[PDB]
Amino acid sequence: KPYVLKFQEIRPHSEALVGGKGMNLGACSNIEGVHVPAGFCLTTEAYKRTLAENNEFTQLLQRLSSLKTSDMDAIREISETIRTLIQHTQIPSEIASYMDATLLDVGGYEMPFAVRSSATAESFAGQHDTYLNIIGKDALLQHISMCWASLFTERAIIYRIQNQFDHRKVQLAVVIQQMISPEASGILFTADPITSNRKSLSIDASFGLGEALVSGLVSADSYTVRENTITNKIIATKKLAIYSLKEGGTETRILEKSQQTKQTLTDQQIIQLAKLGRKIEAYFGKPQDIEWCLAEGAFYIVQSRPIT
Template sequence: MSHFVLGFHEMEKTQLLLVGGKGLNLGELSKIQGIQVPEGFCVTTAGFQKAVKGNETFQALLAQLAMLKVEDRDQISDISRKIRQIIMEAEIPADVAKAVAHYLSQFGEKHAYAVRSSATAEDLPHASFAGQQDTYLNVIGKDAILQHISKCWASLFTERAVIYRMQNGFDHRQVYLSVIIQKMVFPHASGILFTADPMTSNRKLLSIDAGFGLGEALVSGLVSADCYKVQNGQIADKRIAAKKLAIYGRAQGGTETKQIDPDQQMSQALTDGQILQLARIGRQIEAHFGQPQDIEWCLADDTFYIVQSRPITTLFPIPEANDQENHVYLSVGHQQMMTDPIKPLGLSFYLLITPAPMRKAGGRLFVDVAPRLTTRAGREALLNTVGADPLTKDAIMTVIERDFIKLMPNDQTAPIPGNGQTDMPVQFENDPTIVSDLMKRNQTSIEELKQNIQAKSGSDLFDFILEDIQQLKKILFDPQSTAVFMAAMNASAWINENMNE
């Protein structure tokens, strides 16, 4: 009808700035076959911007807020309160209210709705912002919904939301709010599903938190939840909590907290069959989005409804692998005592000069040592190589003991596949002049490079660098150079081994 309101099925993947992260994800969820999402629509950020556009006091307060730091709590609190008051007192533009009324007439004006905030800096792959803006449940009637739209807009400037943006480097003037209007579901049970275990980061272990009634009881911390773990299509663990309270919707609107019957408090919120059914839904959603998901769900009339799905931002990223095999990644930087992330230019350059098959993740480089673990000889060589780092050695021993990587059948002496390393010399001439000759050769190479590179500029400079890298690799992996540092390493190892004698 207008760019002020969009139905879930009308949303496109490119409309993050119009509907926010939560709205965009709901639009995507509603298009997955077999996934049940309560019907709804979104008041876009264009409506919010029109409501505050031209308000000079609002703009002036935003400018003041942008000058503050996290430590300025009193000033943040005062300015945020003033901004919320301005938004609450501002009249919702007539064309926005008209568009909302149009969609309500389609979905049912007398139906109960959840009114939820969706900011443009929310449910992103690198920052979730979950819970920073407000949600209102069981809102009935057009006037009440319009009033709660203003409340959601104002919640963009709660003190906690403002400080969270400051901590994550988001400009208050570049973050806008859309509002989701979604049909209420009154569930028997609800909760949160993580398609990767949030405690261990195990991506194969799915974790479900479940309680009775509306999910707000769990999200707010009012009650403890049952916790179910599912792996490979089977329930791996169950912890049943004493669920003494639950939140339910009231007939006249709003919610209320009720005591749960003592006989029901220790019963499972979900049956075993429902646990496995929900796990399958979670895996389907994860496959659609292509990464582990934090999913809000509810169960009503034996049907699971999905009311939100966002990326799990706390998991360390893993290197991409286009297969279903097991992999064991060692951090290259940690082996070199370089524990900080490497900048993109450094990553790119390192990958151009290394002969080893490396992968990127989280600003770091990794080598997959799984092929080495398929033979006994490979395992022994790898453990000797990483032996100087007891933590890495212990981790690899654990991988071996758990039989995570299978040994090749009847193979004890086969070459180590996928090693990707240059052959290290085991013998070399005892000649001290090797060091001075290497230094002289390298210095001559650098002087030649300085002369040749001065005449290059623009794209020719990059072409020259790429071409020269082949020469650099010859210098870096000169067998004589390798012999020098191996001599130092072998001498050090010999001293350590024989020191007691």
């Protein structure tokens, strides 16, 4: 029914409606805290109401399942067309208004948002778009539309025919977070990722935005924690780190290099983030994949997954 939901407010099964990522985030929102970046979660019924329930589009969609994997030179143009259509389609005022509603508490288009595609299927399908540091309403009405549009790239349209997913059922729910500015960023596996064994928690940790480490453009320390003790640290030479431009976009800075070799997290912050990553582990029961960041001395959970 709803178009937007606030993370704390949402309950299971919000997955049908808010996607896997939004599901996990809301779930995270609950322990408290375990603070989670403020935001909301635009629902699949925006996709449905916006593109769901349209006519150039639906027949276009139909034209597609008259497809094959081997009609190549066509689904290219065709893809371009669906895509342009998703772009050239306005988001109704009402949905647009409900955004402003919940958004004006946290609040306003004051802060810059992260716009993350949020899949239903809790690989190469286009349900992973992340878009950073988007400022103001008009601009995220645009990216919201770009996330939806990603679903109809040739690669995503290839991957869906290959695994016989059907497009008429493709829905995309967009998660919007207000981004805070990081002292540090990182990942945390609550399980040796190679051997699958639990008792060693692994943290990665750099300066600047989290996306830059996840996307692997940047170097990062590597601490290991085993029942409340630091069993290993690896301080990396962090030459680069990425930050968000007030004007907009992101910039890649070169670190002072005195701090290039500064241990990112304090041994005490390390044990701190350890418990946190393991408090979170408790609730899901199974082992997690925790993007995080460190603002003002607070640890926020940006995402949580499960492994594999």
